[PDB]
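To the team - W8W complex, inputs and output below.
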Amino acid sequence: MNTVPFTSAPIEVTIGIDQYSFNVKENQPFHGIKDIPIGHVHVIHFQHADNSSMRYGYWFDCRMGNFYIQYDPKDGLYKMMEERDGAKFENIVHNFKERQMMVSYPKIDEDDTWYNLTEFVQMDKIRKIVRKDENQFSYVDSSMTTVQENELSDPAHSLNYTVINFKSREAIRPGHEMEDFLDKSYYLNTVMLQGIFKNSSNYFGELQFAFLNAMFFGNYGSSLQWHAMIELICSSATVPKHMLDKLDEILYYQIKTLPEQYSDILLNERVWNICLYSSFQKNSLHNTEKIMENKYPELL
Amino acid sequence: GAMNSSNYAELFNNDIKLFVDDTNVYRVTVHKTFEGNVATKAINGCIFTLNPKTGHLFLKIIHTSVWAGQKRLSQLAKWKTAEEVSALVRSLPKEEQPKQIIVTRKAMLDPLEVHMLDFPNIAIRPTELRLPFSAAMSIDKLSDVVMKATEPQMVLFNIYDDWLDRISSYTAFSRLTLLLRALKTNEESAKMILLSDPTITIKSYHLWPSFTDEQWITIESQMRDLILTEYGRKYNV
Ligand SMILES: Cn1cc(Br)c(=O)[nH]c1=O
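Output:
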């Protein structure tokens, strides 16, 4: 069980760790988060008490190093930074744990929520969507734009998601215009799965990561990307039986975990009604369709 | 974006553009079967592709054979329209290719956009005008070449005949839409009007009668009376 030690908490801030969150008051004696389950990626995120603008946060995997948070009063945010001296990450942590100035990642043992949300998410792929290679961890915030958003302005601070566009030459084979626009199986299976993502786990991983960026940071381009990747599968007549089943599970936990009050902005009416009621896969998302109907029947 | 009464004069500037209308592409007669069920039988159709500036009409005849063995014909027809318009553009020399294509029904937007991905610099636009191009099959010579075709065929016309020698494109289009609007609201009367005086003939290389300027004003007036009337007969006013 790993630990993220905070130097200090000089400004009042709501701290999130995966789907958990807690309020820290200005200069409260807070020194980090302990008992973080190894074996998963994690996200630690922040919303300043004074400026609800800019939710920001860091994707990390504890196995890839010792990381700690220290507020930077110049740049005005809580920064993640790696402690190379390992006899410091132990000594510093033990002292703070001994003084019990660390909150406990409060996993319920029956709870598989985080695993189900991050099943296919892998840090090596995050670091290629979020380009900044001197850091083992990856910064995301509410305002970052996606590579495709910049096509339609700073590239170094972009989310380099896989560009999907249904009215593009990549998506439409010359001479199969109608076939390929109404049944995107070509685009899904040959272009994206076999060609770009290599396998469904990399596809699902990016999908899951985009959703989590939409949810935790209200990142609009991530929400576009999550819906696009859903829509491509739903609009494909031919999808591996295993992808459909796993998709229904992925989406179910994403919809389950979404704040009931954020549905208006994070959920795209057109895509969901199409996936669940019009698309080829209308009948293949039983769990997702049941939770959607019972939790947000307004949208449909 | 979309095309309407405000940006109406854009049609007659010097950017090449085409209207595409697909309302006569997929045409059916509906009938009873021996067993008392209903069936359709398709009849030949056409894509109406018009340059409103020059009057050149590119009339692509849709032969019923294109539908054999096909499902969801009404949807396929929009995609067949798009394929044929795209093929037409590709066949034109570059300096003749349109800079815009305006579809008269918004359902054509996606099919044409996808068929024209190779032409990113051609804008595909809808319109809010309620243009009467469906009445094109009420022009006898157009209907005639369509019904007689036995294979796919592209026939070129100038829908303005020789009018541009005497009037502007703007005025030419206005006359054309007035004639077609009349043919659409009451075909019988519109046609009675156009041929009453048997001394005004249609030249072999033309579609409409050879009216003098003065005779066109009378004609045009008669068409407006018909259109207002039919609007009364239809709303009682
Ligand atoms: C200030 N500081 C705090 C931590 Br915790 C760490 O591990 N390294 C460091 O330099």
